[PDB]
From Swiss-Prot, chain A:
One of the primary rRNA binding proteins, it binds directly to 16S rRNA central domain where it helps coordinate assembly of the platform of the 30S subunit. Part of the 30S ribosomal subunit. Contacts proteins S5 and S12. The keyword Ribosomal protein applies. This is Small ribosomal subunit protein uS8. Keywords: Ribonucleoprotein, Ribosomal protein, RNA-binding, rRNA-binding. GO terms for molecular function: rRNA binding; structural constituent of ribosome. Belongs to the universal ribosomal protein uS8 family.
Swiss-Prot record, chain B:
Residues 8-71 form the S5 DRBM domain. It comes from Bacillus subtilis (strain 168). The gene is rpsE. Part of the 30S ribosomal subunit. Contacts proteins S4 and S8. Altered S5 proteins have been identified in a number of mutants. Some mutations in S5 have been shown to increase translational error frequencies. Keywords: Antibiotic resistance, Ribonucleoprotein, Ribosomal protein, RNA-binding, rRNA-binding. Pfam families: Ribosomal_S5, Ribosomal_S5_C. Transmembrane segments: none annotated. Belongs to the universal ribosomal protein uS5 family. It comes from the Bacteria. This is Small ribosomal subunit protein uS5.
Curated annotation (Swiss-Prot), chain C:
Binds as a heterodimer with protein bS6 to the central domain of the 16S rRNA, where it helps stabilize the platform of the 30S subunit. GO terms for cellular component: cytosolic small ribosomal subunit. It comes from Bacillus subtilis (strain 168). Induction: Strongly expressed during exponential growth, decreases 2-4-fold in stationary phase, part of the rpsF-ssbA-rpsR operon. The operon is induced by DNA damage by mitomycin C. It comes from the Bacteria. One of its GO terms (biological process) is translation. Belongs to the bacterial ribosomal protein bS18 family. Part of the 30S ribosomal subunit. Forms a tight heterodimer with protein bS6. The keyword Ubl conjugation does not apply. One of its GO terms (molecular function) is structural constituent of ribosome. This is Small ribosomal subunit protein bS18. Keywords: Ribonucleoprotein, Ribosomal protein, RNA-binding, rRNA-binding.
Length: 131, 163, 65
RNA sequence: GAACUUGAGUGCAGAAGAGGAGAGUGGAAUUCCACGUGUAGCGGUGAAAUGCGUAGAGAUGUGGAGGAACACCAGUGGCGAAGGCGACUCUCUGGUCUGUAACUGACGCUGAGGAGCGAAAGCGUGGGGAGCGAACAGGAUUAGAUACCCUGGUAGUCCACGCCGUAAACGAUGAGUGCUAAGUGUUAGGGGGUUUCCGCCCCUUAGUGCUGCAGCUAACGCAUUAAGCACUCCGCCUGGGGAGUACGGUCGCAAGACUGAAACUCAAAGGAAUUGACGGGGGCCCGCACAAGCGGUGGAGCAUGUGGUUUAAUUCGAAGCAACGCG
């Protein structure tokens, strides 16, 4: 059965990205929606729509490709998993691809990027890497 | 890439005597593997067969000159860590500090030194077959993203990227 | 070829209907294969049961001679 | 703690199926028994023989006995968790699939240990026994033939109960979930499109095949039935022998099963693919290759060369074709 919705959402993006799809639709949740919003703010995806319905909602994500159809998102990794959680100290918050990518940490301040969390001297669960 | 404009050094990585069996005996040939590079961010490899070693090496150089790639280089090192993977060849390439020098295995070193990378850590994590180690190294080097172009793709300034 | 039963709107094949059944057995009494008679898969199975019931009740022969 | 319905399940309406257990019934064929007709072999092999037959065989007609298996249908068809399940009828009974949104509202996934099931052989008790057939006997074959082949043939194969618990038990591929081009068959449904229909076409689920992108792989190949991309849980691997062995423990009537080493020993063992070579593999083609003919050699006397042996020396070299009237 479904065990890691966050991982599953990342995989939908990875798979859709791999075949240069324009858009994908992810079943929504509060945490998945926050991750999607970071990707837009950080310029990894084009746009994100939240469609309501009777069920839990759908996130339509529009992927972003440069000139020459180049994929902006090169890779996505799930770090914290249901089987092995990963929490980081404020000073041990990882940089991703030597600062060319981002890491998404869930903190008590909110769901931030690595840079944002570092400025607040906050740690927390390291959700994913994106580069 | 036009190799004429570039000043290309050539380095002989290996020469394996290979054999095709036929009636009566064995037809030996020599398979030279050569890397060439300008030492200023361009490097390529080629493979040439021939019955005599000099001719094998000549044919490798022409092949290598056809397949030059451009290796992104931040200062004297690579922009970020990468694991070059090709078949069982699996090379890890890490950026290093100034004055570290090139710390790499034999065939990997040829590629990096001819590419003109001065400071880099590497470690072969898979097969040490020269041809495949080189292919893995160049596959990995071909995946290096320069900070400037990433900013353009993501629609941000380099200041926002580095942070 | 087309299935005889779907064409004529035959929902229920019956082992009693000997005259109909006899169109599906060979000269020797062998049940003709579906590939040769064009019957639908579903109706071939129903038809096979009918012929076997008929042969049991002496409406059709097992071996003609 | 309170809600929600997608997961999961229930209700309601349909569908297919060699799913299982029990009890019956049917037709073909083999064997045996009785009888009629009928006469000299039948059977078997590469060739034979052993064997059966004038005491009437084999062949042929009628009837009867008994046991085992279910031609055609039949199909990379169906069903089952796997092993496995194929004549028909009835009794009992499990699961899956489709639609529906009436209901519950996370009730789910995996699962060490444990329990149950688990082809064939085998074992215990008692039945049954046609065909087949380990063992065994005889006839052949062979240098030998404790084999292949032939004629017989015991256990067994079958049934009831119990035990055994192993297979190349294989898709050599754990279970669950989601995501990621297409084309094309086929099985069981649903909806629709022109209709009495038939049908054609379109869509949709769930299985079952082939081809084939991306991706993966050492390669071969996999590819919406993944060996791709992910997440959860379980099992298992760490060079080849020694060895699935020894000791111990558990299980078993026994055979043995499960668990499971080390000393010692080697520097390999191995996977895929490539080039050739070979095959008592296949195809095609050619040659005094065979076939169709002619004349020889091997026998005799002698010439010559060689080997052996004898010599004081019997000079040296040549050894399948490709050395031997050769230097």
């Amino acid at each position: 059965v479904m065990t890691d919705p966050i991982a599953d959402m990342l995989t939908r993006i990875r798979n859709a990205n791999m075949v240069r799809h324009e858009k994908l639709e992810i079943p929504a949740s509060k945490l998945k929606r926050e991750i999607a919003e970071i990707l837009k703010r950080e310029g990894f995806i084009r746009d994100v729509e939240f469609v309501e319905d009777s069920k839990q909602g759908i996130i339509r994500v529009f992927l972003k490709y440069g000139q020459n159809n180049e994929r902006v998102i090169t890779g996505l990794k799930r770090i914290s998993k249901p089987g092995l959680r990963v929490y980081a100290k404020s000073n041990e918050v990882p940089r991703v691809l030597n600062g060319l990518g981002i890491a998404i940490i869930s903190t008590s301040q909110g769901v931030l990027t690595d840079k944002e969390a570092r400025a607040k001297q906050a740690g927390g669960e390291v959700l994913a890497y994106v580069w | 890439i036009d190799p004429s404009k570039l000043e290309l050094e050539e380095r002989l990585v290996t020469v394996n005597r290979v054999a095709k069996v036929v009636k009566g005996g064995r037809r030996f040939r020599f398979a030279a593997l050569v890397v060439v590079g300008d030492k200023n961010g361009h490097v390529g490899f080629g493979t040439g067969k021939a019955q005599e070693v000099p001719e094998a090496i000549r044919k490798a150089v022409e092949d290598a000159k056809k397949n030059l790639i451009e290796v992104p280089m931040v200062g004297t090192t690579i922009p970020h860590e990468i694991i070059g993977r090709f078949g069982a060849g699996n090379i890890l390439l890490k950026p290093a500090s100034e004055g570290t020098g090139v710390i790499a295995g034999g065939p990997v070193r040829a590629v990096l030194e001819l590419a003109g990378v001065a400071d880099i850590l590497s470690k072969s994590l898979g097969s040490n077959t020269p041809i495949n180690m080189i292919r893995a190294t160049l596959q990995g080097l071909s995946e290096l993203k320069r900070a400037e172009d990433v900013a353009k793709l993501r629609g941000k300034s380099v200041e926002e990227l580095l942070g | 070829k087309v299935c005889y039963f779907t064409s004529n709107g035959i929902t229920h094949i019956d082992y009693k209907d000997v005259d109909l059944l006899k169109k599906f057995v060979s000269e020797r009494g062998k049940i003709l294969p579906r590939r040769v008679t064009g019957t639908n898969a579903k109706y071939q199975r129903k038809l096979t049961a009918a012929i076997k019931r008929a042969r049991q009740m002496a409406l059709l022969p097992y071996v003609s001679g």
